[PDB]
UniProtKB/Swiss-Prot annotation:
Source taxonomy: Bacteria, Pseudomonadati, Aquificota, Aquificia, Aquificales
GO BP of this protein: tRNA guanine ribose methylation
Reported function: Catalyzes the 2'-O methylation of guanosine at position 18 in tRNA. Type II methylase, which methylates only a subset of tRNA species.
Pfam families associated with the record: SpoU_methylas_C (PF12105), SpoU_methylase (PF00588)
Subunit structure: Homodimer.
Signal peptide extent: none
The protein, known as: tRNA (guanosine(18)-2'-O)-methyltransferase
Organism: Aquifex aeolicus (strain VF5)
Gene Ontology molecular function: tRNA (guanine(18)-2'-O)-methyltransferase activity; tRNA binding
EC code(s) of this entry: 2.1.1.34
């Protein structure tokens, strides 16, 4: 019966998932920050998290820091960021990238309620120059101190919660963006993958 409870809870979670709000982690340095980002994705309703990492990208999530959240977000390793992002762009997704530059706009000026792929990272200016070249929006978070930037996980949460606020205002968490077919498919899949190993 206990397992029924988790699936019940999984269903409620899937009914609030934003199949439309995608996150792309561009070369996030340490696993502690990566795990925190996974937790944050889960918190705002992000269902898909893609990532690109040094030497292949064999990312090891910390269960003690993810609290098991790594289980209800699809995490997919990508070998070519621009190629993957172009796939979303051609599908109508706006590519929003954190780019540390005076030419970038305040992150609150973006409309996160439309299909969006938020790209964050630990390259010199946030995302790589290769990625920013294809972005629709280049964003920064206002700073008033000596630090030029914020910890990548903290910045990701700040931006994603602005997205949460906007979507909440439009009632996008009040109705499922995933269809019942998709919800049932995921329930079955994860209930299966959770056991098998």
């Amino acid at each position: 019966l206990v397992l029924e409870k988790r699936l019940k809870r999984l269903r409620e979670v899937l009914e609030k998932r934003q199949k439309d709000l995608i996150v792309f982690a561009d070369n996030v340095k340490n696993e502690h920050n990566f795990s925190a980002i996974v937790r944050t994705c889960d918190a705002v309703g992000v269902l898909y998290l893609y990532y690109y990492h040094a030497e292949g990208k064999k990312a090891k999530i910390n269960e003690g820091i993810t609290q098991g959240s790594h289980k209800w977000v699809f995490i997919e390793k990508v070998d070519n960021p621009v190629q993957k992002l172009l796939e979303f762009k051609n599908r109508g997704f706006q590519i929003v990238a954190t780019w540390l530059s005076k030419e970038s706009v305040n992150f609150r000026e973006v409309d996160y309620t439309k299909p969006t792929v938020l790209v964050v990272g630990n390259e010199l200016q946030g995302v790589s120059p290769e990625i920013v070249e294809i972005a629709d929006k280049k964003i920064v978070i206002p700073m008033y101190g000596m630090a030029q930037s914020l910890n990548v996980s903290v910045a990701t949460g700040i931006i994603l919660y602005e997205a949460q606020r906007q979507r909440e205002e439009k009632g996008m968490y009040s109705r499922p963006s995933l269809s019942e077919e998709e919800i049932q498919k995921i329930l079955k899949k994860w209930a299966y993958e959770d056991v098998i190993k």
